Amino acid sequence: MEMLTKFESRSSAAKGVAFHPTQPWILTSLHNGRIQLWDYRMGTLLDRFDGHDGPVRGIAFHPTQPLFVSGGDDYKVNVWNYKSRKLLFSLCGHMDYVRVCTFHHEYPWILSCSDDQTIRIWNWQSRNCIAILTGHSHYVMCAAFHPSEDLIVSASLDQTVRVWDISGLRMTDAIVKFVLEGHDRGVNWCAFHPTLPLILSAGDDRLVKLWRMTASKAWEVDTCRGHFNNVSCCLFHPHQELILSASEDKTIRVWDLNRRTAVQTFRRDNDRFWFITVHPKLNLFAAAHDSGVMVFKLESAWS
Protein backbone atom coordinates (compact mmCIF):
# COMPACT_ATOMS: atom_id res chain seq x y z
CA MET A 1 0.00 0.00 0.00
CA GLU A 2 0.91 3.67 -0.35
CA MET A 3 0.42 6.70 1.90
CA LEU A 4 -1.12 9.76 0.23
CA THR A 5 -0.30 12.58 2.65
CA LYS A 6 -2.86 15.39 2.61
CA PHE A 7 -1.55 17.46 5.53
CA GLU A 8 1.42 17.55 7.89
CA SER A 9 2.04 19.68 10.97
CA ARG A 10 5.48 20.30 12.48
CA SER A 11 5.23 20.91 16.22
CA SER A 12 6.06 19.62 19.67
CA ALA A 13 5.41 15.88 19.98
CA ALA A 14 1.77 15.09 19.25
CA LYS A 15 0.03 12.71 21.65
CA GLY A 16 -3.55 12.72 20.37
CA VAL A 17 -5.53 13.55 17.25
CA ALA A 18 -9.29 13.76 16.71
CA PHE A 19 -11.16 14.02 13.42
CA HIS A 20 -14.22 16.23 13.30
CA PRO A 21 -17.03 14.02 11.94
CA THR A 22 -18.37 16.54 9.39
CA GLN A 23 -15.89 19.38 9.12
CA PRO A 24 -12.39 18.96 7.59
CA TRP A 25 -10.73 19.59 10.95
CA ILE A 26 -8.42 17.73 13.29
CA LEU A 27 -7.69 18.54 16.90
CA THR A 28 -4.14 17.77 17.98
CA SER A 29 -3.03 17.51 21.61
CA LEU A 30 0.66 18.13 22.18
CA HIS A 31 3.41 17.29 24.65
CA ASN A 32 3.68 21.01 25.46
CA GLY A 33 0.12 21.08 26.83
CA ARG A 34 -1.42 22.90 23.87
CA ILE A 35 -4.29 21.81 21.62
CA GLN A 36 -4.32 22.84 17.96
CA LEU A 37 -7.38 22.93 15.71
CA TRP A 38 -6.34 22.50 12.07
CA ASP A 39 -8.15 22.57 8.74
CA TYR A 40 -6.32 19.86 6.81
CA ARG A 41 -7.88 20.76 3.45
CA MET A 42 -6.63 24.36 3.63
CA GLY A 43 -3.60 23.75 5.85
CA THR A 44 -4.70 26.51 8.23
CA LEU A 45 -4.46 26.74 12.01
CA LEU A 46 -7.99 27.69 13.03
CA ASP A 47 -7.54 27.97 16.80
CA ARG A 48 -5.34 27.18 19.79
CA PHE A 49 -6.51 26.11 23.25
CA ASP A 50 -4.47 26.52 26.45
CA GLY A 51 -6.03 24.62 29.34
CA HIS A 52 -3.43 22.16 30.60
CA ASP A 53 0.03 22.04 32.17
CA GLY A 54 2.14 19.24 30.74
CA PRO A 55 1.31 16.79 27.96
CA VAL A 56 -2.28 16.38 26.75
CA ARG A 57 -2.88 12.79 25.64
CA GLY A 58 -6.69 12.63 25.48
CA ILE A 59 -8.62 14.56 22.84
CA ALA A 60 -11.97 13.93 21.15
CA PHE A 61 -14.86 15.74 19.47
CA HIS A 62 -18.43 15.17 20.44
CA PRO A 63 -20.11 13.62 17.37
CA THR A 64 -22.89 16.24 17.17
CA GLN A 65 -22.46 18.91 19.85
CA PRO A 66 -20.02 21.85 19.39
CA LEU A 67 -17.80 20.34 22.07
CA PHE A 68 -14.49 18.59 22.47
CA VAL A 69 -12.89 17.03 25.53
CA SER A 70 -9.22 16.98 26.51
CA GLY A 71 -7.32 14.98 29.09
CA GLY A 72 -3.89 15.88 30.43
CA ASP A 73 -1.00 14.81 32.59
CA ASP A 74 -2.28 17.48 35.02
CA TYR A 75 -5.11 14.99 35.83
CA LYS A 76 -7.82 17.30 34.42
CA VAL A 77 -10.55 16.37 31.95
CA ASN A 78 -11.52 19.62 30.24
CA VAL A 79 -14.73 20.19 28.28
CA TRP A 80 -14.57 22.90 25.62
CA ASN A 81 -17.00 24.65 23.29
CA TYR A 82 -15.13 25.23 20.04
CA LYS A 83 -17.80 27.56 18.61
CA SER A 84 -17.70 30.03 21.50
CA ARG A 85 -14.03 29.09 22.07
CA LYS A 86 -14.55 28.75 25.82
CA LEU A 87 -13.32 26.25 28.39
CA LEU A 88 -16.71 25.29 29.83
CA PHE A 89 -15.44 23.38 32.88
CA SER A 90 -12.86 20.95 34.22
CA LEU A 91 -13.83 17.50 35.50
CA CYS A 92 -11.52 16.80 38.44
CA GLY A 93 -11.25 13.47 40.20
CA HIS A 94 -8.46 11.53 38.55
CA MET A 95 -5.34 11.38 40.72
CA ASP A 96 -2.76 10.69 38.00
CA TYR A 97 -2.15 11.27 34.28
CA VAL A 98 -5.22 11.06 32.05
CA ARG A 99 -4.47 8.82 29.05
CA VAL A 100 -7.72 8.89 27.05
CA CYS A 101 -10.99 10.80 26.99
CA THR A 102 -13.93 10.31 24.63
CA PHE A 103 -17.61 11.18 24.29
CA HIS A 104 -20.38 8.61 24.11
CA HIS A 105 -22.35 8.65 20.85
CA GLU A 106 -25.80 8.53 22.50
CA TYR A 107 -25.66 9.08 26.25
CA PRO A 108 -24.39 12.43 27.59
CA TRP A 109 -21.30 10.69 28.93
CA ILE A 110 -17.56 11.29 28.89
CA LEU A 111 -15.18 8.35 29.34
CA SER A 112 -11.71 8.83 30.81
CA CYS A 113 -8.97 6.53 32.08
CA SER A 114 -5.88 7.33 34.06
CA ASP A 115 -2.58 6.16 35.49
CA ASP A 116 -4.47 6.18 38.83
CA GLN A 117 -5.72 2.71 37.75
CA THR A 118 -9.35 3.81 37.26
CA ILE A 119 -11.76 4.44 34.42
CA ARG A 120 -14.25 7.24 35.07
CA ILE A 121 -17.57 7.93 33.37
CA TRP A 122 -18.84 11.49 33.65
CA ASN A 123 -22.16 13.03 32.70
CA TRP A 124 -21.21 16.23 30.91
CA GLN A 125 -24.73 17.64 31.36
CA SER A 126 -24.57 17.40 35.17
CA ARG A 127 -20.75 17.70 35.46
CA ASN A 128 -20.81 14.75 37.89
CA CYS A 129 -18.79 11.56 37.94
CA ILE A 130 -21.39 8.79 37.57
CA ALA A 131 -19.10 5.74 37.73
CA ILE A 132 -15.55 4.78 38.71
CA LEU A 133 -14.47 1.45 37.22
CA THR A 134 -11.81 -0.20 39.40
CA GLY A 135 -9.99 -3.50 39.14
CA HIS A 136 -6.91 -2.78 37.07
CA SER A 137 -3.71 -2.99 39.14
CA HIS A 138 -1.61 -0.58 37.05
CA TYR A 139 -2.04 2.35 34.67
CA VAL A 140 -5.14 2.20 32.49
CA MET A 141 -3.63 3.31 29.17
CA CYS A 142 -6.81 3.21 27.11
CA ALA A 143 -10.56 2.75 27.31
CA ALA A 144 -13.31 2.87 24.70
CA PHE A 145 -17.08 2.71 24.43
CA HIS A 146 -18.58 -0.03 22.28
CA PRO A 147 -20.37 1.44 19.23
CA SER A 148 -23.63 -0.50 19.71
CA GLU A 149 -23.55 -2.34 23.07
CA ASP A 150 -23.32 -1.22 26.70
CA LEU A 151 -19.68 -2.24 26.96
CA ILE A 152 -16.33 -0.62 27.68
CA VAL A 153 -12.96 -2.13 26.79
CA SER A 154 -9.85 -1.01 28.67
CA ALA A 155 -6.11 -1.68 28.44
CA SER A 156 -3.70 -1.55 31.36
CA LEU A 157 -0.03 -1.94 32.17
CA ASP A 158 -1.18 -4.80 34.43
CA GLN A 159 -1.03 -6.85 31.18
CA THR A 160 -4.81 -7.31 30.92
CA VAL A 161 -7.53 -6.09 28.59
CA ARG A 162 -10.85 -5.75 30.41
CA VAL A 163 -14.32 -5.75 28.88
CA TRP A 164 -16.85 -4.16 31.24
CA ASP A 165 -20.65 -4.47 31.25
CA ILE A 166 -22.14 -1.02 31.85
CA SER A 167 -25.77 -2.02 31.21
CA GLY A 168 -26.59 -1.21 34.83
CA LEU A 169 -25.35 2.37 34.63
CA ARG A 170 -27.35 2.80 31.42
CA MET A 171 -30.53 1.89 33.32
CA THR A 172 -23.79 -3.02 39.84
CA ASP A 173 -23.57 -0.01 37.52
CA ALA A 174 -20.45 -1.60 35.99
CA ILE A 175 -19.25 -5.21 36.15
CA VAL A 176 -16.14 -6.71 34.59
CA LYS A 177 -17.23 -9.25 31.97
CA PHE A 178 -13.91 -10.43 30.51
CA VAL A 179 -10.38 -10.16 31.85
CA LEU A 180 -8.49 -10.99 28.67
CA GLU A 181 -5.08 -12.55 29.31
CA GLY A 182 -2.42 -13.10 26.68
CA HIS A 183 -0.17 -10.07 26.56
CA ASP A 184 3.10 -10.79 28.37
CA ARG A 185 3.79 -7.10 29.13
CA GLY A 186 1.76 -3.96 29.72
CA VAL A 187 -1.05 -3.18 27.28
CA ASN A 188 -1.11 0.33 25.80
CA TRP A 189 -4.19 0.39 23.57
CA CYS A 190 -7.51 -1.30 22.85
CA ALA A 191 -10.08 -0.77 20.11
CA PHE A 192 -13.45 -2.09 18.96
CA HIS A 193 -14.35 -2.78 15.35
CA PRO A 194 -17.12 -0.38 14.24
CA THR A 195 -19.48 -3.17 13.11
CA LEU A 196 -17.91 -6.58 13.85
CA PRO A 197 -17.61 -8.13 17.34
CA LEU A 198 -13.82 -7.78 17.34
CA ILE A 199 -11.28 -6.20 19.68
CA LEU A 200 -7.71 -5.06 19.00
CA SER A 201 -5.12 -4.65 21.75
CA ALA A 202 -1.47 -3.60 21.58
CA GLY A 203 1.30 -3.37 24.14
CA ASP A 204 4.89 -3.25 25.32
CA ASP A 205 5.27 -6.91 24.26
CA ARG A 206 5.30 -5.52 20.68
CA LEU A 207 2.17 -7.53 19.92
CA VAL A 208 -1.12 -6.52 18.34
CA LYS A 209 -3.71 -9.10 19.40
CA LEU A 210 -7.06 -9.69 17.71
CA TRP A 211 -9.96 -10.95 19.82
CA ARG A 212 -13.52 -11.93 18.95
CA MET A 213 -16.41 -11.93 21.39
CA THR A 214 -20.02 -12.99 21.66
CA ALA A 215 -22.54 -11.98 24.30
CA SER A 216 -21.25 -14.83 26.48
CA LYS A 217 -17.60 -15.52 25.60
CA ALA A 218 -14.44 -14.22 23.95
CA TRP A 219 -11.24 -15.71 22.57
CA GLU A 220 -7.92 -14.68 21.10
CA VAL A 221 -8.11 -15.02 17.32
CA ASP A 222 -4.48 -14.37 16.36
CA THR A 223 -1.49 -12.09 16.92
CA CYS A 224 0.17 -9.60 14.59
CA ARG A 225 3.91 -10.06 15.14
CA GLY A 226 6.65 -7.86 13.76
CA HIS A 227 6.92 -4.55 15.61
CA PHE A 228 10.30 -4.30 17.32
CA ASN A 229 9.37 -1.76 20.00
CA ASN A 230 6.36 -0.81 22.11
CA VAL A 231 3.13 -0.61 20.12
CA SER A 232 1.45 2.68 21.03
CA CYS A 233 -1.84 2.38 19.19
CA CYS A 234 -3.95 0.15 16.97
CA LEU A 235 -7.23 0.42 15.10
CA PHE A 236 -9.47 -1.35 12.62
CA HIS A 237 -9.70 -0.01 9.11
CA PRO A 238 -13.42 0.89 9.00
CA HIS A 239 -13.96 0.28 5.26
CA GLN A 240 -11.39 -2.44 4.49
CA GLU A 241 -10.32 -5.78 5.99
CA LEU A 242 -7.15 -4.28 7.43
CA ILE A 243 -5.55 -3.67 10.83
CA LEU A 244 -3.33 -0.66 11.54
CA SER A 245 -0.77 -0.32 14.32
CA ALA A 246 1.63 2.44 15.36
CA SER A 247 4.81 1.88 17.32
CA GLU A 248 7.80 3.42 19.05
CA ASP A 249 9.81 1.47 16.45
CA LYS A 250 8.93 4.43 14.17
CA THR A 251 6.59 2.40 11.95
CA ILE A 252 2.94 2.33 11.08
CA ARG A 253 2.09 -1.22 10.05
CA VAL A 254 -0.87 -2.43 7.99
CA TRP A 255 -1.98 -6.02 8.53
CA ASP A 256 -4.48 -8.31 6.86
CA LEU A 257 -7.52 -8.62 9.12
CA ASN A 258 -8.23 -12.15 7.89
CA ARG A 259 -4.69 -13.55 8.07
CA ARG A 260 -2.81 -11.08 10.33
CA THR A 261 0.06 -11.04 7.83
CA ALA A 262 1.99 -7.86 7.13
CA VAL A 263 0.54 -5.87 4.23
CA GLN A 264 2.64 -2.70 4.33
CA THR A 265 5.07 -0.95 6.65
CA PHE A 266 5.56 2.82 6.66
CA ARG A 267 8.57 4.19 8.53
CA ARG A 268 9.78 7.57 9.73
CA ASP A 269 13.52 8.04 10.14
CA ASN A 270 13.47 9.94 13.44
CA ASP A 271 9.91 9.97 14.84
CA ARG A 272 8.26 7.47 17.14
CA PHE A 273 4.52 7.05 16.62
CA TRP A 274 2.26 7.69 19.61
CA PHE A 275 -1.26 7.53 18.18
CA ILE A 276 -3.28 6.78 15.06
CA THR A 277 -6.94 7.43 14.32
CA VAL A 278 -9.34 7.18 11.40
CA HIS A 279 -12.20 9.32 10.16
CA PRO A 280 -15.55 7.66 10.97
CA LYS A 281 -16.73 7.83 7.33
CA LEU A 282 -13.84 8.68 5.00
CA ASN A 283 -10.69 6.83 3.99
CA LEU A 284 -8.77 9.32 6.13
CA PHE A 285 -6.20 8.54 8.81
CA ALA A 286 -4.11 10.66 11.16
CA ALA A 287 -0.91 9.76 13.01
CA ALA A 288 0.76 11.60 15.89
CA HIS A 289 4.53 11.32 16.25
CA ASP A 290 7.56 12.96 17.87
CA SER A 291 7.57 15.85 15.35
CA GLY A 292 3.86 16.54 14.83
CA VAL A 293 0.87 15.10 12.97
CA MET A 294 0.19 13.68 9.52
CA VAL A 295 -3.17 13.15 7.80
CA PHE A 296 -3.16 10.65 4.96
CA LYS A 297 -5.19 8.38 2.72
CA LEU A 298 -4.32 4.69 2.58
CA GLU A 299 -4.28 3.45 -1.02
CA SER A 300 -3.35 0.25 -2.82
CA ALA A 301 0.13 0.25 -4.31
CA TRP A 302 0.37 1.87 -7.76
CA SER A 303 -3.24 3.02 -7.63
Numbering used by the authors: 1 to 171, 200 to 331
Give verbatim excerpts from the published study on this entry.
Hence, this loss of critical proteins has the potential to compromise ER proteostasis and generate cellular stress. This challenge to normal metabolism is overcome by the activity of the cytosolic coatomer protein I (COPI) polymer, whose repeating unit is the coatomer, a 560 kDa complex of seven distinct gene products (α-, β-, β′-, γ-, δ-, ε-, and ζ-COPI)25–31. Overall, the coatomer functions to retrieve the escaped “client” proteins, such as type I membrane proteins, from cis-Golgi back to ER by retrograde trafficking. In particular, the S protein – a type I membrane protein – is delivered to the ERGIC from both the ER (by anterograde trafficking) and the Golgi (by retrograde trafficking)3,10–12. Here we utilize recombinant SARS-CoV-2 S proteins and tail peptides, including constructs with enhanced mimicry of the coatomer binding motif (clientized S protein), to elucidate the atomic structure of the S-coatomer interface.
To gain insight into the role of the basic cluster in stabilizing S-coatomer interactions, we generated alanine mutants of αWD40 Arg13, Lys15, and Arg300, which are equivalent to the β‘WD40 basic cluster residues Arg15, Lys17, and Arg272, respectively. Biolayer interferometry (BLI) assays showed that Arg13Ala weakened αWD40 binding to both wild-type and clientized Thr1273Glu S heptapeptides, although the affinity for the clientized S heptapeptide was still 2.8-fold higher. A 1.9 Å resolution crystal structure of this αWD40 Arg13Ala mutant showed a binding site architecture comparable to that in wild-type αWD40, attributing affinity weakening to the alanine mutation. F Superposition of wild-type (white) and Arg13Ala mutant (yellow) crystal structures shows minimal perturbation near the mutation site. In contrast, Arg13 and Lys15 residues in αWD40 provide the basis for basal binding to both wild-type and clientized S molecules.
